[PDB]
Each structure stands twice: as structure tokens, then as C-alpha cells.
């Protein structure tokens, strides 16, 4: 399972999207090398202006490339599901707007790891800092916080993300995840943990559609050795 790891590996991220009634798609791509925990990605808005900010779909847009230190490897249940996969379901609520539900389902086509999303977003504001754009393009650090749920032989998570408002303050989304294996065999079902993530947005200069570049680390980490 981390087997299919030891390198670099190709991704390929497929979201569609409805938030109030605004229905965009989203294109990414790129490659992954779980070795170094690293990530690089390039997403397009293939419908247009993407309708809400780029920084908010972050998270939703493959923790399976993950760095798990060799003491702790015996936790990583993302790789543990491959190649069959994983569904990896979100409710994002944004403090004092709406929600967004994702249903994605992480796995190999062949040697290329595909992330494909569903994502529907309710009860946003019309001009609240999600609609109204008012998020910077950028992004903090933050903790997934991960436990076991051995009755659907998979994992939860919850964590906080703080998006920076251009006027200083700070829009928070809460994250409740749950994730559950494709296939019938057996999984790693993990000891508390969490996955320390470091994530840079930008933009690539000669890119005249809609998009995002992002760069992400991903370090397993909490488990005493
Ligand atoms: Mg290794
Ligand atoms: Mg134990």
C-alpha cells in the first residue's frame, strides 16, 4: 500500500461545484512524492471565475501524500486503502455563513492518484467574505487532528482553518471529515495523531484562466516514540 509511494507519483484533482446556485468545475494537476510529504498542484477554473475564493477550497482539493516518520508508519491509514481508495467526506462550516459538504473519492487510475469531488455549498452570504471575496490569496499553517473510527474501519478528523480577511481579521472554517476504505481489505486504523500541513498559494505568470498554483507539506506527527 505505501508501497505505491516510494516516489513520485502523478495527480489528478476533478471537482464540480455548486455554491448558491453557482455551478463551477475545477481541473488539477500535478505530482506528489509522500518521501518528502510534498505536494504541487495546478488548478483551472474550467467554467470561468471560479465564484468563490481559491483559498477556500483548498482542503477539499490527498493526504495519502502524507510524510509518516518510519516510527510511525504503522498509523497511515491513507496510504493503507491504496490502490482501492478511500471516500473522504467534509462539512466546512464557515463561522457566521454557509457550509460547504464534500463527497470525494481518493484512488489509482492506473499509477496516477485521482481525487474526485462533489462539492455543494449552502446558505453563503451575498456579500459575506466568501461570496464578496474578501479573503486574501494566501494561507496558515495549521493540524488535521486524526482518531480512529473502528466501527466504519476508518478515520475522523476536525480541525480549524483561518482564512485571512483583507481587512486583518480572520474568517474561520471548521472541518469535521470522516474517511472509510473502497475496498475490503485491511486498513490501519490509527493511534490520535495529526498531520502538521504547511501550504503556499501563487499564481503562474503566463496563466490567463483562472487558477491556482499550490505548493503543500504534509508531516504525520503527535505519536510519542
Ligand atoms: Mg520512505
Ligand atoms: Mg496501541
Not at 74 to 87: C, I, L, N, R
Amino acid at each position: 500500500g505505501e508501497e505505491l509511494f516510494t516516489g513520485v507519483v502523478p495527480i489528478l484533482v476533478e471537482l464540480d461545484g455548486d455554491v448558491n446556485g453557482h455551478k463551477f468545475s475545477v481541473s488539477g494537476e500535478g505530482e506528489g512524492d509522500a518521501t518528502y510529504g510534498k505536494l504541487t498542484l495546478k488548478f483551472i477554473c474550467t467554467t470561468g471565475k471560479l465564484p468563490v475564493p481559491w483559498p477556500t477550497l483548498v482542503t477539499t482539493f490527498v493526504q495519502c501524500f502524507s510524510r509518516y516518520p518510519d516510527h510511525m508508519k504503522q498509523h497511515d491509514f491513507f496510504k493503507s486503502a491504496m490502490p482501492e481508495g478511500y471516500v473522504q467526506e467534509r462539512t466546512i462550516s464557515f463561522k457566521d455563513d454557509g457550509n460547504y459538504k464534500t463527497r470525494a473519492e481518493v484512488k489509482f487510475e492506473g499509477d496516477t492518484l485521482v481525487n474526485r469531488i462533489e462539492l455543494k455549498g449552502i446558505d453563503f452570504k451575498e456579500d459575506g467574505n466568501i461570496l464578496g471575496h474578501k479573503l486574501e490569496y494566501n494561507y496558515n499553517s495549521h493540524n488535521v487532528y486524526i482518531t480512529a473510527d473502528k466501527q466504519k474501519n476508518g478515520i475522523k478528523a476536525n480541525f480549524k482553518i483561518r482564512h485571512n480577511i483583507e481587512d486583518g481579521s480572520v474568517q474561520l472554517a471548521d472541518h469535521y471529515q470522516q474517511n472509510t476504505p473502497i475496498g475490503d481489505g485491511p486498513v490501519l486504523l490509527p493511534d490520535n495523531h495529526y498531520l502538521s500541513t504547511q501550504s503556499a498559494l501563487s499564481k503562474d505568470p503566463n496563466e490567463k484562466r483562472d487558477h491556482m498554483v499550490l505548493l503543500e507539506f504534509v508531516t504525520a506527527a503527535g505519536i510519542t516514540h
